[PDB]
Design a protein around this nucleic acid. Structure first.
Lengths: 50, 524, 76, 397, 228, 248, 230
RNA sequence: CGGAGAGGUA
């Protein structure tokens, strides 16, 4: 539960509980650039491979 | 590389050949405008007609130099407003849609000053512009010399372009809103306020409706004097009693003097109003037709407002047997699938049988829906209810031909059903549901393929059609009629085209409007 | 004023020389040289010329005969 | 054209109406890039009949091998479908499959649309064309003067607001020590402290900044003094966001009826009370850049001294040469007083005649000041000064 | 606070029947308020004089044809709707119409009194043919308000008049057609002001401008004592 | 507040907005009903069961229940935030059915059919049937009419040609392309093309002469020789391909 | 013939809600009077509203101030809803001066003898800084209708002072009106109906005075039709 | 106001 949620509850008419919560919706950009810029112990996508 | 151009040599006419004394704005509807009028923003009128304002101010002694005129127009005082009224009173302007597919895509109107920030377009003319008030944006061009104004008024004024230049028949026609108002007026009931009483003409008909002492819907016996064009061009007044409705008589007194009453003595669909305008045009002329169109637009709009025709969730009825029909279709397709797994039918044959079953089920659903809507409203007269045109909103909404169709509403209350998948083939399982109930995830995804294909097709065909009309204008730009007669006895044969096994176009239309090449005879 | 050109079209069937003669009439009422034959409503020369042509007061015959005659009286 | 495998990875109802439809997609809500670069969508694994909560990010190729049941056909008891025959998709085509013949099911019912498309309520009641258009216009909504929750939302409003960067999210939980329209100071809890002391956590608020489209974005402090907050909650509401929920537009009273034909095709009639409430009113922040450059005739200067101009324009200009912050300005006035060293002073005899009559002056430096565009107005809210090293600072800098 | 009052009211008349009155300028929204208020005043409840009851000396049925008449009784009932009668004295007065001979029995054949005035020179009321070639009519013309249907009266009437005393609908108000339209009007910079145009067609029993001004007097009487 | 065209629904196939209206009308009703409860300053528990019932409405719905929130302060904060309607979450393919919307309307003491008979405030009379009224969520798009309007009469011109263009202090005239030229050609629009291509667009001598003429108090034209064709002529000559004029 | 409607008991549902009744009104006149009065009330009533706000701390609408949970934007938005009536002066300048933490409300404004604040518990802002001071010079004046703060700026070519912030002034004391015509039974004749007007107003105008002013405006408008000049 | 690229609009 969230304190900001307590200040205004939005009524949901959904009938199936969300089995998988919505992931971070900008995960594509952050994941791509972290694969790019982080250190590598082996040849893989990033500056190390180049 | 800039000798060559796309499309065409650039700076001659495209791209782009821009022009002064022109503007552009979003368009709003003005339903108070006469057919020859448009609503133009006051600021746009000010900074479009600036040389006219300068000339008039210097002529009237209100300014002594061009600099004084500049100061006067930038101050935007009340003095320059009268000057602008003077210069706009008779001076017309052309409204223009950016994708121009025909000459009616540009038309001249009389600019009517409006406060606001957008241009007002006549509701009847948007069909000619192929412009829908959904964010579409129009341009204005101002004729300057006398020749331009005269020529725009004679040819490009919307009153002079009431007939399509492609196939005949009029292009300005009540589309949806005035159509709904008129259809609401001319409906009849079996029992309502002010039924079975006798009235003299539409005067106390208007009196009785508008005071609330008599309902719009009433089988009322009214003494009306209708004028007919007979003899050699004379008006004959036939005064007689006919059974009609109060709203129909109220519409009749709107109808210009000189038309038969049978045109308004019926429930009016879009075709009915088109036929009334056609009759007025070939019977009276131009000005009576313009006045009739303006007045019918006003009355239809006003009584659409007074009707309170509203789309809701209980004004759109799902058939009671729709679930039964769906269940029967499921049973039949289950039997077909069982036979297919039994090896009794082939995959293609099974596919065709499933498509046929689902098409039949969809047709049955549509028929049940339309039967439910046609006579949903039944009213007792003395203890017995009688069938009548339903007071249900969507039934008028479609039957009037306002906006929608049998197939268009067939997917709101019925089911949109079968459609195409990628490669264009029809999906085995149709859209079993509609917009009035929950669309399954797969069902909406499948409908998305059709929507995407339609939108991409519209874009591609827009590009291709622009290029094709470009080519066609290129090839035929030099073709102009230059002689009245050539005395050629050769010509072409016209027959009513019978392709396949049935006639698809009658002989009358193709022969209509032509000039005979030889004196035809009788068959025998 | 007048907004419909149907009467002028009936008078001048070609309705292209109609534009020419209407422009001529309107220009030399706008530019000095004559005065309109139909009374004014603070209207522009355009609709005044239209209302004249509808009444059959000005056409190519009237225009060019007036031009001829005014040439003879102006020349001598 | 959309593809049968285009499902659940990129939104089929989110794509521009222009001549690039079907090429520019938007990623589905739950889709993510694989390790090699393919798009994979989560699916709940179905062991025998039970649809477990565990998820597998099936790739496009892996998806085709298995049969995928729909999020519809709700689950009773632990994980069994209510319907013995459930709607599934084996290669992209809808079909009926046994509950014991499925291999995967949709994790949720929103993972077939984008974030923009998932926000539309009652999406199962609109045409795909029309809903696609509406999702396209949602992205074009301009942030209203005061954000206000939609009465009828989807529930993705909170996720969109939080996951976007416009939301001031509490990095570390604690008790709000100091609330201000510009700053939020949180007294961090003792169990979230780094070793030693780090004290407060400060959140400076983005206030009235041109985002990218000449539109105002500002973050609205939604908390008060002493309110206990935890990590991950909304300390301040971003633009088009109220109480941590997306606030794209505003709820309005509506009647569906053709009022006198002033609303004729899709035209809309607005009450005067809409303007009374000052709602559907927007703040638009235009950025105008004046660059003082070094020319071969001399370096340009930013100053209030502008050759041959009226003092009325300079009245709002400081001695530094930049208009005050807060002055109301209209088109044609001077914002930044740039001057450029004139190469030479040559006067045409016509220019001499004009300056003799009008009393014009002669200067060895030409006006090049940034004037307000003719057609815009407003208030100066932010002045940014960029001066590289080796250039002397002035009063405004 | 300052207020706006109309300048140079305009009027255009067609005979004494069809009047178009234009008022300008009107404050925003005021034009249609005045138009609709005076419209309802003229329509639903407007003082006037009209025929109330008629006599039947032949067949008391209302669906047969009168002897010596070529048309049904219904159409002479409809004809007597539009007759222009103006009463200057006692409210309820008797009019006798006695005419023999084939042809149009018109408004001229009615008796002329000092209590009843006919400002309607000629109008066909009945047509006589050679069956009896005579008509005898006695009618009550009364002062009344608005429009009162005979079907409305019979429902609310428990006592029945003697046989032959046919009840006829009453067009009491002097105005039979009224319509209002409001359009944009421009004064100074403002162009949200409204032109107000009223069109009205009366039975000729009063000048239409007089009808408007006396309806306005009625409403001003209704609103007057509110003002201190 | 807002009047929408009912005619856009039976064609453009978006009746969800209609549902958005009805579910709106209920929600704001729930907002209004508690709002009156706020005005009477009623005891906290009353608001408590009202909100609990409002959230509990629906079948097989996951929202959980109170009291898990604080008894007084959090309940008051929730009520104050709920006075302007009550937010409703509607999953796109798992949203509220018709029955749920009707129930929420009923709890709002409003027409369950979703239509209340309005009175036309313009003239003050009700219509023959009730109209659909409710609260719908409207978005103000970044297609403002202020940013879209423009026009001009005289201003900037290019340094390569006399076509009007330049900046946004006075943007050039609108691009009357060849498509609209054909549109005029289909009419007997012959002079209008000549003004709109030669004197109003290119011929600088024509532009000046016509501006002076209109200022002088007449509408007359000079024929002119557009500079666009002169540019084309010069650059044809630039490649060693001759262009000349057959002088009349 | 005619019997004039007479004002009868004016009850107060609340300080903002009032029902005014006209009992002896003839049939056919109820809806006319109700519509006319409703239109006049929503159109032509005089009222007091804020135009210029002069906050010492900030310089323009878009600049925040220290120690407040509300931007100056919401300061102006809330001051728009300031329910205030003035009696003697057509234009007044209220002064708000408050320091210390707490919700700064309408009652905190220094009230003069000519100015009455009918809404004291109206929250203006929240001063969350223990030693900050909020100082507002609020110009409140009489007017009618709704004047966006974009017309007086053209009358003087931009406000000469910078600290003054212009607010679109809505001089509308009444925000909701309804009228119901009901079949009244009274010894007076036999055919009269009662008109009840329910009114939600900001409480800055007396309902009796509001009805009287509306009737006065209606009579002054009908004056032209009563006597046609031409 | 010299020309490319992107988005959105119709």
């Amino acid at each position: 539960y969230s304190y900001t949620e307590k200040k205004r509850i939005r009524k949901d008419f959904g009938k199936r509980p969300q089995v998988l919560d919505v992931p971070y919706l900008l995960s594509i950009q952050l994941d791509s650039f972290q694969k790019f810029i982080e250190q590598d112990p082996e040849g893989q996508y990033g500056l190390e491979a180049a | 590389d800039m000798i060559k151009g796309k499309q065409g040599r650039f700076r001659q006419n495209l791209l782009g050949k821009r022009v002064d004394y022109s503007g552009r704005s979003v368009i709003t509807v003005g339903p108070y405008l006469r057919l020859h009028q448009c609503g133009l923003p006051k600021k746009m009128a000010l900074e479009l007609f600036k040389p006219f304002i300068y000339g008039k101010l210097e002529l009237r002694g209100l300014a002594t130099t061009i600099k004084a005129a500049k100061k006067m127009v930038e101050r935007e005082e009340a003095v320059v407003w009268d000057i602008l009224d003077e210069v706009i009173r008779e001076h017309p302007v052309l409204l223009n849609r950016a994708p121009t597919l025909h000459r009616l895509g540009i038309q001249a109107f009389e600019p009517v000053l409006i406060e606001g920030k957008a241009i007002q377009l006549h509701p009847l003319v948007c069909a000619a512009y192929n412009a829908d008030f959904d964010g579409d944006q129009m341009a204005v061009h101002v004729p300057l010399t006398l020749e331009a104004q005269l020529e725009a008024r004679a040819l490009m004024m919307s009153t002079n372009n009431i007939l399509s230049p492609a196939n005949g028949e009029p292009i300005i026609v009540p589309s949806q809103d005035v159509v709904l108002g008129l259809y609401y007026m001319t409906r009849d009931c079996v029992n309502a306020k002010g039924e079975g009483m006798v009235l003299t003409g539409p005067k106390e008909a208007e009196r009785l409706y508008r005071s609330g002492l008599a309902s719009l819907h009433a089988r009322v016996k009214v003494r009306i004097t209708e004028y007919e064009k007979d003899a050699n061009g004379e008006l004959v007044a036939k005064t007689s009693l006919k059974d009609t409705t109060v709203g129909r008589a109220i519409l009749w007194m709107i109808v210009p003097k000189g038309l038969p009453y049978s045109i308004v003595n019926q429930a009016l669909g879009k075709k009915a109003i088109s036929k009334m305008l056609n009759t007025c045009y070939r019977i009276l002329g131009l000005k009576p037709t313009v006045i009739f169109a303006d007045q019918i637009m006003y009355t239809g709009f006003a009584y659409a407002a007074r009707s309170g025709a509203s789309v809701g969730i209980d004004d759109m009825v799902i058939p009671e047997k729709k679930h039964e029909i769906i269940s029967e279709a499921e049973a039949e397709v289950a039997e077909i699938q069982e036979q297919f797994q039994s090896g009794l039918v082939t995959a293609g044959e099974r596919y065709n049988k499933v498509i046929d079953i689902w098409a039949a089920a969809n047709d049955r659903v549509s028929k049940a829906m339309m039967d439910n809507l046609q006579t949903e409203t039944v009213i007792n007269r003395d203890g017995q209810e009688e069938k009548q045109v339903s007071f249900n909103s969507i039934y008028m909404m479609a039957d009037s031909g306002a906006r929608g169709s049998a197939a268009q509403i067939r997917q709101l209350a019925g089911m949109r059903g079968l459609m195409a998948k990628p490669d264009g083939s029809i999906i085995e399982t149709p859209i079993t549901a509609n917009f009035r109930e929950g669309l399954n995830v797969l069902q909406y995804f499948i409908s998305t393929h059709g929507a995407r294909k339609g939108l991409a097709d519209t874009a591609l065909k827009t590009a291709n059609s622009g290029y094709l009309t470009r080519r066609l204008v290129d090839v035929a730009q030099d073709l102009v009629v230059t002689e009245d007669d050539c005395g050629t006895h050769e010509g072409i044969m016209m027959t009513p085209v019978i392709e396949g096994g049935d006639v698809k176009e009658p002989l009358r239309d193709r022969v209509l409007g032509r000039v005979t090449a030889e004196d035809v005879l009788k068959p025998g | 004023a007048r907004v419909t050109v149907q009467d002028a079209v009936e008078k001048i069937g070609n309705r292209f020389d109609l534009v020419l003669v209407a422009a001529r009439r309107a220009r030399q009422m706008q530019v000095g040289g004559k005065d309109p034959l139909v009374p004014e409503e603070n209207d522009k020369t355009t609709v005044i010329a239209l209302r004249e042509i509808e009444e059959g007061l000005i056409n190519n015959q009237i225009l060019d005969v007036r031009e001829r005659q005014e040439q003879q009286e102006q020349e001598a | 054209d959309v593809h049968p495998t285009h499902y659940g990875r990129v939104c089929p109802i989110e794509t521009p109406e222009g001549p690039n439809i079907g090429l520019i997609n938007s990623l589905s809500v739950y889709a993510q890039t694989n390790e090699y670069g393919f798009l994979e969508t989560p699916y709940r694994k179905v062991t025998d009949g039970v649809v477990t909560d565990e998820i597998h990010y099936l790739s496009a190729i892996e998806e085709g091998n298995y049969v995928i049941a729909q999020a519809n056909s709700n689950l009773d008891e632990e994980g069994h479908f209510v319907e013995d025959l459930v709607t599934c998709r084996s290669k992209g085509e809808s079909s009926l499959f046994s509950r014991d013949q499925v291999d995967y099911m949709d994790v949720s019912t929103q993972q077939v649309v984008s974030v923009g498309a998932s926000l539309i309520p009652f999406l199962e009641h609109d045409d795909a064309n029309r809903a696609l258009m509406g999702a396209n216009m949602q992205r074009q909504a301009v942030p209203t003067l005061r954000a206000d929750k939609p009465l009828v939302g989807t529930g993705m409003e909170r996720a969109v607001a939080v996951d976007s960067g416009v939301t001031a999210v509490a990095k570390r939980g604690g008790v709000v020590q100091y609330v201000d329209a510009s700053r939020i100071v949180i007294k961090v809890n003792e169990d979230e402290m780094y070793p030693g002391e780090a004290g407060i956590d400060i959140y400076n608020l983005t206030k009235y900044t041109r985002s990218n489209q000449n539109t105002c974005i500002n973050q609205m402090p939604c908390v008060s003094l002493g309110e206990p907050v935890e990590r991950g909650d909304v300390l301040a509401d971003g633009p088009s966001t109220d109480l941590g929920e997306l606030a794209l537009g505003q709820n309005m009273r509506v009647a569906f009826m053709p009022w006198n034909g002033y609303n004729f095709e899709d035209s809309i009639l607005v009450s005067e009370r809409v303007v009374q409430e000052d709602r559907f009113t927007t703040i638009h922040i235009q950025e105008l850049a004046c660059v003082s450059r070094d020319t071969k005739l001399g370096p340009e200067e930013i100053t209030a001294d502008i050759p041959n101009v009226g003092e009325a324009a300079l009245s709002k200009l400081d001695e530094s040469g930049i208009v005050y912050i807060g002055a109301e300005v209209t088109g044609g006035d001077i914002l930044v007083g740039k001057v450029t060293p004139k190469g030479e002073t040559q006067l045409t005899p016509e220019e001499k005649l004009l300056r003799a009559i009008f009393g014009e002056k002669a200067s060895d430096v030409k006006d090049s000041s940034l004037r307000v565009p003719n057609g815009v107005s407003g208030t100066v809210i932010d002045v940014q000064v960029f001066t590289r090293d080796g250039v002397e600072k002035d009063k405004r800098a | 606070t300052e207020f706006l009052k109309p300048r140079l009211v305009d009027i255009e008349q067609v005979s004494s029947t069809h009047a178009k009155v234009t008022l300008e300028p009107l404050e925003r929204g005021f034009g249609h308020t005045l138009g609709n208020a005076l419209r309802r005043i003229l329509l639903s409840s407007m003082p006037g004089c009209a025929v109330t009851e008629v006599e039947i000396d032949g067949v008391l049925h209302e669906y047969s044809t009168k002897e010596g008449v070529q048309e049904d009784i219904l159409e002479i009932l409809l004809n007597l709707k539009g007759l222009a009668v103006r009463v200057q004295g006692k409210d309820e007065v008797i009019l006798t119409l006695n005419k023999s001979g084939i042809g149009p029995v018109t408004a001229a054949d009615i008796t002329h009194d000092g209590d009843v005035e006919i400002v309607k020179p000629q109008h066909v009321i009945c047509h006589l043919t050679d069956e009896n070639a005579s008509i005898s009519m006695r009618i009550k013309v009364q002062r009344g308000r608005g429009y009162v249907p005979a079907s409305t009266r019979i429902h609310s009437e428990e006592d029945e008049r003697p046989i032959g005393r046919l009840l006829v609908d009453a067009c009491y108000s002097p105005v039979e057609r009224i319509a209002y339209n409001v359009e944009a009007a421009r004064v100074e910079q403002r162009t949200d002001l409204d032109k107000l145009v009223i069109e009205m067609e009366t039975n000729g029993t009063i000048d239409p401008e007089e009808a408007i001004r006396r309806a306005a007097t009625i409403l001003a009487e209704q609103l007057e004592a509110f003002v201190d | 507040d807002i009047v929408l065209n009912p005619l856009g629904v039976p064609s453009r196939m978006n009746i969800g907005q209609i549902l958005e209206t009805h579910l709106g009308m209920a929600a704001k009703g729930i907002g209004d009903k508690i709002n009156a409860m706020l005005k009477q300053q009623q005891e906290v528990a009353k608001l408590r069961e009202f909100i609990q019932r409002a959230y509990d409405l629906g079948a097989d719905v996951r929202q959980k229940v109170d009291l898990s929130t604080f008894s007084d302060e959090e309940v008051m904060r929730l009520a104050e935030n709920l006075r302007k309607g009550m937010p409703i979450a509607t999953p796109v393919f798992d949203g509220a059915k018709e029955a749920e919307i009707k129930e929420l309307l009923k709890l709002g003491d409003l027409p369950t059919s979703g239509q209340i008979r309005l009175y036309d405030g313009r003239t003050g009379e009700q219509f023959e049937r009730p109209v659909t009224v409710g609260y719908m969520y409207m978005l103000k798009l970044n297609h403002l009419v202020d940013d879209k309007m423009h026009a001009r009469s005289t201003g900037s011109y290019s340094l390569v040609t006399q076509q009007p263009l330049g900046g946004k202090a006075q943007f050039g005239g609108q691009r009357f392309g060849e498509m609209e030229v054909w549109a005029l050609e289909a009419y007997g629009a012959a002079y209008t093309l000549q003004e709109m291509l030669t004197v109003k667009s290119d011929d600088v001598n024509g532009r000046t002469k016509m501006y002076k003429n209109i200022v002088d108090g007449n509408h007359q034209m000079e024929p002119g020789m557009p500079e666009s064709f002169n540019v084309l002529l010069k650059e044809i000559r630039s490649l060693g391909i001759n262009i000349e004029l057959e002088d009349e």
